[PDB]
Amino acid sequence: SITENTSWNKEFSAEAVNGVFVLCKSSSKSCATNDLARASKEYLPASTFKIPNAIIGLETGVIKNEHQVFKWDGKPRAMKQWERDLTLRGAIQVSAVPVFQQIAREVGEVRMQKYLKKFSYGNQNISGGIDKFWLEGQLRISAVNQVEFLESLYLNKLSASKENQLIVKEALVTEAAPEYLVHSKTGFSGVGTESNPGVAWWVGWVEKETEVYFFAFNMDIDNESKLPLRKSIPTKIMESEGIIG
Amino acid sequence: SITENTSWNKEFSAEAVNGVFVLCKSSSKSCATNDLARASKEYLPASTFKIPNAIIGLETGVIKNEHQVFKWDGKPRAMKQWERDLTLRGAIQVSAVPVFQQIAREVGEVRMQKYLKKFSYGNQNISGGIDKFWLEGQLRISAVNQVEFLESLYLNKLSASKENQLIVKEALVTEAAPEYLVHSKTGFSGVGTESNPGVAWWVGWVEKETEVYFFAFNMDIDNESKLPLRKSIPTKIMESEGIIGG
Known part of the structure; x- marks a missing residue:
């Protein structure tokens, strides 16, 4: 059950950002957002697709193991x-599109479709070319669906080996301290146009200690200079809730 | 095979220290150390023992999974x-004793002995009490053996499931950047005296990028203020080797 926290809009109004943040404590049954409508609206995943793509690459054997160079x-x-x-970790962390385009080609359409159905990944529409559907094609996913998918991964509940889920999880580590650990991935589709802007994600x-918080942020973006807001807006909201190292 | 680089002794002498650093690029077949003799001398592992203990905990079912609280x-x-x-990660990283004492008790001496044989873990001597052999007992391991054990873990070659090896590896992450990731563990037996020092480990x-470096450091500790050298000396040596920066 998601609720709308109107105070969270304060962080968006300052930058005139049209976006959404979804934050869930413990599980996806306990979520809050600044915008209920936008929370389930679906957008191009952009480089956030490297998470399922990496899992699928490992599952199909296209990626040999976590030490593939x-x-x-x-x-x-x-x-x-x-x-x-x-x-593998480096390619995910620097968002090396061409590496993952070649992985997608080797996975192929039939297997990609099968795994996105298993993962309940957005509209599951991979039309637009096997190497560009998540970048400029027809695939769409919402912030709420991202959190559902990530919770599954956290719990090793996706339809993939536990080993492959664990490999991808270590590849997503971005902040580490003894009692604080963050797994995360950014996305940016481009700047589109003023009338049809791009999308950015985190x-x-x-x-933190023995608690876990799942999160998804997206925003409309038509100026590359605003890109850092995809991390700073969610971080400010999370820090205001005491989620900080 | 392992080579000696005595020019590294500078980094220890400056700061009071008797110790050893072993550093290996790609594999344990390409290693260097400041002191060949000390590199093979065996010391109490202290909390570096949390690495095998955690794996054994998971393998035996004493620890349920990565999410156990x-x-x-x-x-x-x-x-x-x-x-x-x-x-689990928290218990390893804040180095929470009592947690690992209970794990050891539950595993038991026969199983613990069995796994340390499989892991070729030091002198494999676990006398001293099942909940303190690594802290005050007879167990000893060298820096060379630490590197060998860690390389096996890195490669998923220990006698344990790959899943359990992966779980323990994430719990060891201590630094993270896109193309730089460190897995590590400290240990410290206690501050000894000048004549009967304790041991500290990192x-x-x-x-780094597409290369991997295995390392093991230990030093004699007879002054509480010198503890941070267990990270700063290895860091300085690794910086001189071009690993840290660019």
Whole structure:
């Protein structure tokens, strides 16, 4: 049961951001958001899709194990940060699209469709090209569905081996302290246009002491300069709730 | 095979210390140390023993899974740091004794002995009391053996399920950046005296870009103020090797 916390809009009004934050304590049965309507509205997942794509790559054997190195062929890539050999974790953490485009091609449409049905992943529409459906195609997922999916992963309840779920979880670690641990992933589809803006995401979970909080944030974005808000707005909200290391 | 780099002794002498650092690139077939003799000398593992103990706990079913919460009964602990409920990761990282003493008791001496044989864990001598052999007992392990054991864990080659090895590995993450990840564990037997020192440890591995480095450090400790050197000396050596920065 999700409730609407109107005070959480304060953090969005300052930057004139149209977006949504969903935060759940312990389980997805206890959630709150700044915007009930937008919470279940579906958007391109962009690089947040690297989470299911990595699990599927491991499940199908396309990715051998957690120590696979994705070698760079020396050919130009869109971001300099991607122009190097990367581990599975590195490729996820730097959001190396071309690595995951090749994984998706090797998985193929039939297997991709099967796993997204098992994972209950959004509208499950992978039309738009096997290497671009999550970037510019027809796939859509809401913030609420992201939290449901992440909770499954946290609990090892996805239809995949526990080993493969654990591998992907360590790849998502982004903040670590003795009694505080964050697993998270960003996404950014691009800037679209003023009338049809892009979308930016931050999704994950926080473990503080013996509690766990699942979260998903998205926002409309038409100016790349606003990108950091995808982390700072959720972080400010979480810190205001005492979720801090 | 392991080579000696005496130029590293500088980093220890400056600060009072008698100790050893072992550092290996890619595998334990490419290792270097400041002191070959001390690299193979065996010392009490102290809380570095939480690594095998946790794996054994999971393998035997004593620890249920990665999400088990170790609840505090309310009775006082040596430290207030531990008078709280802890996850497995928390119990490893705040180095919560009583949690691991109970795990050891439940595992029992016969099973504990069996797993330390499978893991080739030091002198495999667990006499001294089942809940204190790694803290005050007869168990000893060298820095070289620590690296070998950690490399096996990294590769999922210990005699344990891959799932349980993965669970324990996430619990050991202590630093995280996109292309830099550290798994590590400290240990400290106590502050001894100048003539009968305690031992302090830092062991782990660093994944930097697509390379991996295994490490194990120990030092004699006879002054409480010197404890942080267990991280700063290895850090300085690793920085000199180009691992830390760029």
